[PDB]
Symmetry: C8
Subunit: 184 residues, 8 copies
Amino acid sequence: GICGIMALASAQMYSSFEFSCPCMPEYNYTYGIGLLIIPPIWFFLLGFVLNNNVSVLAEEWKRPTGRRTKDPSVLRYMLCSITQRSLIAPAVWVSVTLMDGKSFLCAFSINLDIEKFGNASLVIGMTETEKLKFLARIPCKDLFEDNEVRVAATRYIKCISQACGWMFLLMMTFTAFLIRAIRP
Amino acid sequence: GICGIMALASAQMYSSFEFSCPCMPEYNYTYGIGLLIIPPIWFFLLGFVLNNNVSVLAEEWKRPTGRRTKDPSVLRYMLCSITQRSLIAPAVWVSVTLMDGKSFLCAFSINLDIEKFGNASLVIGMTETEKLKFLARIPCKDLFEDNEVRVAATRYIKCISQACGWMFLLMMTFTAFLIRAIRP
Amino acid sequence: GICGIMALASAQMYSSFEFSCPCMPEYNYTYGIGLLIIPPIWFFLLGFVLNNNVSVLAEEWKRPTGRRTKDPSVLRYMLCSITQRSLIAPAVWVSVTLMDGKSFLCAFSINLDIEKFGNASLVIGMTETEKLKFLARIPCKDLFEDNEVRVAATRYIKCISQACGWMFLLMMTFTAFLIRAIRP
Amino acid sequence: GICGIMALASAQMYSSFEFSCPCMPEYNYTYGIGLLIIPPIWFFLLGFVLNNNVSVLAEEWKRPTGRRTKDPSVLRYMLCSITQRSLIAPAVWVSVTLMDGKSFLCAFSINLDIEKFGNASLVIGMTETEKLKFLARIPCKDLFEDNEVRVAATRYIKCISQACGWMFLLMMTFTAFLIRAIRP
Amino acid sequence: GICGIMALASAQMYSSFEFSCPCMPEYNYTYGIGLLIIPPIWFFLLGFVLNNNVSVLAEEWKRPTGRRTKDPSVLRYMLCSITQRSLIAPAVWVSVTLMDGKSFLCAFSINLDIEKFGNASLVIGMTETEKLKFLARIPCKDLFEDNEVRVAATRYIKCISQACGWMFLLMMTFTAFLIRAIRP
Amino acid sequence: GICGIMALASAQMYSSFEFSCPCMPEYNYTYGIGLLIIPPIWFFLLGFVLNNNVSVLAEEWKRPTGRRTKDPSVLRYMLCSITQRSLIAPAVWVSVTLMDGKSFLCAFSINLDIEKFGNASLVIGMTETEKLKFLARIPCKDLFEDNEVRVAATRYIKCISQACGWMFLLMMTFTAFLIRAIRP
Amino acid sequence: GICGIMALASAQMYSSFEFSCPCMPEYNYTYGIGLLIIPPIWFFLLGFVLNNNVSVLAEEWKRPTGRRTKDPSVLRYMLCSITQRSLIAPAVWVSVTLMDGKSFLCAFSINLDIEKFGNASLVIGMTETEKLKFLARIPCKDLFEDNEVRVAATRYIKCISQACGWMFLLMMTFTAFLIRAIRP
Amino acid sequence: GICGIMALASAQMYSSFEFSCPCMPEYNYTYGIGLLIIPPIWFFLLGFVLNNNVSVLAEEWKRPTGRRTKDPSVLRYMLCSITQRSLIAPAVWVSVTLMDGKSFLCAFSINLDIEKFGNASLVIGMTETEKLKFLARIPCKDLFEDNEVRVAATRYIKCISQACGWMFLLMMTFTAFLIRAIRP
């Protein structure tokens, strides 16, 4: 119920989210990786909070030994089962974020090698500080002057991000395959 | 019921609201921060007023001691529970307002350092009064002459506002996590 | 029932209303303030007329003393309660009219000080009659020649109108908060 | 039932009606005032015809004295009540027609004073016949040469028509207020 | 039932009908008046044919005197009542056709006086045959060279057609008013 | 049931059909008249095939005399009644095809007289073979060079096709009027 | 049920199919005729596979003589009846494919005679290999240089394909007419 | 149920997927073939995971011999039946991916022979490394300079991919035809 609702909400919240990459070398990595990390953590704690069966977990965690009516075997089972139920909306966020490649373009555009894409006369005679300030404006469509380099560098990091998007989806599905094959 | 209605109404009222930043240095801060503060206060008092269970709170607050049929333990519990039920539509407003970054762009565009973004020849030979009147027109798209500086300064304060939007959402969710883990 | 219908009708009638500011100094104030005053009075008398419980008020007001089956205590209560039920659609009109700022732009564009916005060479060597005829055409987009002054003066009176729109909404909600806290 | 249907039909028939002002001085007044008068008369006789309770009025009007089973007190009451029920769709027509101001622009554009709006060199050296033929083409957007005079004269008669539209709505609502306060 | 269906079908069939005026003086009058006359005759015979109560009229008309089980008083009543029920979809066609004025523009554009609208130098030195071939192309937007004369002549015959459209609607409604006031 | 379905299907299949007139004099007549004749024949045999009451007609036609349980009076009645039920979707096709006039424009554009429409200098000094190849490209919008002649010739054959469309609808309705007045 | 579903699916799958004619003389015929032949064969085997009554056909075909509970008379009847039920979605595909004429344009544009359409100076002094490579690019809108020849050759093969589309529909309907007139 | 859901989800996930071919010769083949191979493997393991009848397969696979309540004949039958039920959403992906031809264009554009399409003067005097870097940018619309070669090479590999798309659909349907003809 709420698992399918939060999975649809995670894809819908990414669609309405307006990605504003700062295009500065100090704040590209923390913004690009931070939108890959911090909204999954919020969707994970939303999976604890919106599920009202954390309250029964709370009452059987707060009371000391002797008062525990249920054995902790079903407690370990339920806390595990509520984690792998609340691990869908984080995984849907990291799926669609890696499929679009906006965060890999924002975070990893200062690690590129510019000789592979377009003119070799771009960065000639330019210091590492100004070269980092030149490479960082690649995700900004209206701040980069060379359009052919910008489409070449966008397609390179978007295909790598889509490769990591499918390798993440295969590792997640194969993990849930092993979970529903040995544990219940 | 009305909590989900007011949460959807707060996001819908922001979408129909037309943000008109004054682009004057005397009235940028009060308008930009005021749209972050004053509509949450109105949505908080709307959470008291539209909930008709403030009337039973009113009758057990007006009558003096001796006439009180209920002990004030359930009174403290209910006034607390109606506050954390009416703290959703304010929090949805501050969420979407910080996600768009229009108020942080309107209020904090007189605190910028203009050397980081574009031409260094912009503010040379210009007094602090005219420099404040030059920096204040950054949120106004049709009043600013340098477009590359305007997109650079917009993206800088929009990513900082989105960082504060996610840090607010994490602090709010972790607070409600502790509330539903110790109190009921 | 009809309170929510008239509240939605007041917002919908403003959306279909085509604001035609006359852009003349004799008729700006009466048209701009008159659209803020006269449609709330019509929506207030519509709250009396469409509510068929004004007929029972009519019969117990027309008959003299002695024939009055009900005591006037419930009569004062019901006439008060029908006023604060019919004070929603007027308040929704003044809310959305102040949020858009078209009436404050139409009525108060002859009180502006033109040195704050754009060129100081606009009104130089111009008589008070022609200066009033120059300032009055600010709300008319297709009658004003200086576009930068027009957007600056529009944003100034629209933010002031939105400030008065939120101060009206706070004073109205805090008043209805006190009404539902002492009276019933 | 049919009162709300005819009220919605009167607003919908005005929206689909294509206003073709003749822009001739002989036929502006009769067309502009005639669309304000003649469609309310048709909607009034439609309120008699579509209401099948005119047939019982017909049978108790045709038979002479002695055969009248009902006293004429309920006959005066019912003929009055069917008039104030069939006076809604005429009033909705005159409301929306005065709110748009197309008929006041078509009928009263030969009464204007052209010095108030634009160039004083328009009508200089021009006979009353050609001046009437020049002023009459104001509602025709594609027949008038001076666009600034045309928008100024349109906004002047549209705000006056909207003033008469609200004064008509206030006089109609206050009349129906007195009707439902003394008569039943 | 089928009366409201045929009334909506007559307005819908006019909306999907593509008016192709021939713009020739031999065939303007027969096409323009013929679309005002011939589709009402087809909708009138459709009111006889689709109403299956013409079959009982057929059986009591074919059998001679002596075999007639019903007296012809109800036969005159029913044939009259089926005519005034099948006189709605013809009247809706002539209503919307006169409201748009395309047939009056097509049929009566050879009767115009061209001095009233635009340049007097249009028809100077031109024979009655070529003048009829010049006036006939007024309804054709892409065959007439003088656009100001074309909009002036269109608005003249469209307002006259809308005057005859409202005088037809008043004469039809007042006739049906007298029918439902004396006959049943 | 299926009569109204096939009538709506015939109008819908014409709307989705893309009329590609060949614009060659050998194949204009057979294509233009063939789309008026051959799809009505297919819709007529579809009226036999989709109606499953052709099977009972088949069994009482195949068996010789003596085995016929029903007299052939109801057989003549039913085969006639299934023809005039399956004569609606052919008639709807010929109605909408003559209302649009594309087939009369495609088939009869080699019979025109070109002096009536535009320049007399078009076909001067041109052989009957090249004149037939010049007149045949009138329905092709992107193959004809003279646009004023093309709109004049299109409007001439479209009004004649709409005249034959209404004369067909009157002859069909008057025929079905006589059928439902004498036969049942 | 599934017959009407597969018929609607065949028309819908053609509408979403993007026709990419190769415009090479070696692969025009096999692609153009192959899209007319191979998708009907797939829709025919889909009519066997999706119909689960092929399994009962499978069990009474695999078992040898003696074990056959049903006589093969109903087996011949059912295998025939399932073929003429699964011959609808192939026939709908060949219908809409011949109505659009894209396959006849792709497959038969190397058989054309180019003197009939446009300039005779196109193929003069050109070898059969380059003439086949010139004629093959007729279905490709963005690979053919002469647009008037391309629209003339498109309209010629599209009208011939629509002629074969209607002759196929007449031969198919007349065949199904004979089937439902002699066999059941 | 979930088979038709996953089949519609596979076609819908391809429609929302944004194909970003890297247009580099090292990473064209692995990206183009990898999007044909890796998403079918994920949809195949999704057919195991979302079907909860893998848990009963898990319990009867983990327990050793002696504890097996069911014989492994129904185990081989069910594991086979769940594979041919979960082989629909992979097959729908490879169907629509080969129908669009984007992966065959991305993976096989370094194997082309450029003399067949356009100018022979393109690759003259160019090394195999730069020729591979020139041919690889064919799927990139905004990175290839010769548009006529790009449309010719796109149509060549899209028709070959559509040929392999129909040969895959015929081999898959004929295989499922043999499965439902011998096995159950």
